[PDB]
Symmetry: C3
Subunit: 150 residues, 3 copies
């Protein structure tokens, strides 16, 4: 300690992060369940198309997961916490729909993949705008002071 | 700067995080070593069951790795740093045992997969309790003030 | 709020993190593009060696991505922000070269894999040194006070 804490600046981000982990846990338990239904034992990640879709829906979500966390936290700190958290929920809800769709059909992964991309791209844009607002003033000022010499 | 820092609030979490990275590095060097022993060259992630087990033990640890980091940090900030760090070590030690076991035998991955799940689930529960202690008082208060109007 | 913020302690780390996410996004759009060129539809991650190389270059970068983020942030907080950010850029530029090389040829992945390992290992070493500078003084002091009793 510290007679102050900054938890109240990031608790929405932390809540959306936790929801994210729970969703990834669900995807994982669904793969375990597909291994049982389709008798596909580790090591070994191939089997019927219907087992491969569930496996692949989960692996896809897992590989985008750190991009989402990174971008969430940077947008939430540098741009606005509520906005970032809100895009976060939208991304996670689109990922649930991606996973459920892909499991039924490769073609049904597409509409929600696109919803999830719009939401991550918006987080990236908010992260860039916040970082630009952080760095640009001081860089322009320094450039200008440099020219000031009559 | 800053005439204060908050490093002393997260240095255990940071130490367990670093240990985590070193463990994932080890798993990776062990896959490189299995590629050599079994003459399985990239691209290409199939070969003898014994090469596939090492590959798969590493990929499994890598896909749960961000869930562990996310949950560690949220539990450590919102619930209690020492507790979270301690569950963290237990999870990582169980992941070493998972990797070593899975390499010998698919069946030997199971006991430590279950130890690692208990430890991650405890981190998730501590993260949820901390977030609940953060949000519930103010939400109940607002609900109640709403009713106060005689 | 808070009448102070600690954004100015981590904005380089946040910028390098954002650049990292954009690079991983690029790798992903390149896999989508290889699926089109080589007519390899999900689920399903095998096809011509040239499709498998692009797929695998991306999956490899994605699995090291959280190790990089973890290590970046710990080195940047506990050791020195500019140094960590700089090793960060070097790692990311080596990852671009890895991806481009691996896509052309499995053998062309090697020189930049090694550049990217040197840069991550340096981040790990800076993270360890910072954590050692944080923990060692107080541990040695406590050990010594323990002996002090005549
Ligand atoms: C930070 C943001 C990261 C960005 C990630 C980008 C993801 C979102 C943009 C996705 C657009 C790509 O979607 C695209 O993928 C594949 C082509 O290579 C195709 O995917 C298709 O594969 C088929 C056969 O090839 C079938 O298995 C499927 O039903 C599908 O129609 C789609 O017909 C196409 O629409
Ligand atoms: C946040 C927490 C995330 C939660 C992750 C959950 C992981 C921990 C719970 C794991 C329980 C699942 O374990 C389960 O997996 C597989 C079934 O689908 C089976 O795994 C089995 O596969 C076989 C044949 O099918 C063999 O390759 C193995 O020896 C094994 O016995 C197990 O017999 C079962 O016990
Ligand atoms: C925190 C840091 C994490 C550390 C990650 C370590 C990555 C960096 C060290 C990499 C060194 C390993 O590189 C090594 O991989 C493979 C052996 O198993 C081989 O990779 C080789 O595989 C071949 C046939 O087997 C071909 O597909 C390739 O052209 C290549 O030459 C290399 O001949 C070797 O040089
Ligand atoms: N990637 C998944 C996640 C679901 C999961 O973690 N399953 C556990 C128990 S079956 C496991 O050890 N998977 C083996 C593996 O990933 O190779 C899988 O393919 O199985
Ligand atoms: N995922 C592992 C990690 C071990 C590793 O990173 N190996 C390096 C050198 S062999 C690599 O370029 N792997 C190629 C790949 O992942 O496709 C692998 O399958 O090889
Ligand atoms: N891992 C990549 C990333 C590129 C990507 O995310 N593609 C989207 C649209 S084709 C997808 O749904 N991939 C299906 C999958 O990963 O199984 C892939 O193999 O396709
Ligand atoms: C890899 C995921 C990136 C995680 C980065 C999270 C680190 C945040 C560090 C500074 C937090 C300071 C409190 C917020 C200050 C503010 O909101 O203005
Ligand atoms: C994706 C991994 C999530 C990482 C989130 C880490 C960010 C921490 C930000 C606030 C830290 C403030 C110091 C701790 C305050 C306290 O312990 O009460
Ligand atoms: C999983 C990625 C690990 C992310 C950890 C990032 C959390 C940082 C928390 C404390 C930040 C306090 C501001 C910096 C203090 C300083 O530089 O001395
Ligand atoms: C603007 C408010 C955003 C709400 C985020 C709530 C997170 C819910 C996770 C349970
Ligand atoms: C001090 C040098 C800072 C350069 C950082 C620029 C980041 C811009 C991110 C958009
Ligand atoms: C710190 C003070 C900012 C100086 C202003 C530089 C002008 C460019 C901003 C538009
Ligand atoms: C309660 C204390 C927890 C200890 C965590 C130590 C981390 C060791 C990593 C080397
Ligand atoms: C201000 C709205 C906050 C809603 C967040 C609720 C998080 C609960 C997490 C358990
Ligand atoms: C901020 C003060 C908390 C108000 C108390 C609300 C009561 C519910 C807590 C149990
Ligand atoms: C020492 C300075 C390091 C510069 C990091 C700049 C990040 C650029 C990302 C755009
Ligand atoms: C209080 C106990 C602290 C033990 C942490 C040691 C971390 C060393 C990391 C190198
Ligand atoms: C806190 C004060 C540090 C006490 C000094 C312990 C001596 C070992 C450092 C070298
Ligand atoms: Ni005090
Ligand atoms: Ni001062
Ligand atoms: Ni005030
Ligand atoms: Ni402060």
């Amino acid at each position: 300690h510290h007679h102050h804490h900054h938890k109240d600046e990031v608790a929405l981000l932390a809540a959306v992060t936790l929801l994210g982990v729970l969703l990834q846990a669900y995807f994982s338990l669904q793969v375990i369940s597909a291994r049982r239904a389709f008798r596909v034992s580790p090591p070994l990640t191939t089997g019927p198309p219907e087992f491969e879709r569930v496996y692949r829906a989960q692996v896809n979500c897992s590989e985008y997961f750190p991009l989402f966390l990174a971008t969430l936290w940077v947008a939430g700190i540098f741009f606005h916490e509520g906005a970032a958290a809100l895009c976060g929920l939208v991304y996670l809800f689109a990922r649930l729909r991606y996973f459920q769709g892909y499991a039924r059909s490769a073609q049904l992964r597409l509409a929600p993949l696109y919803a999830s991309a719009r939401a991550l791209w918006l987080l990236v844009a908010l992260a860039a705008l916040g970082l630009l607002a952080h760095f640009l003033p001081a860089a322009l000022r320094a450039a200008l002071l440099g020219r000031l010499r009559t």
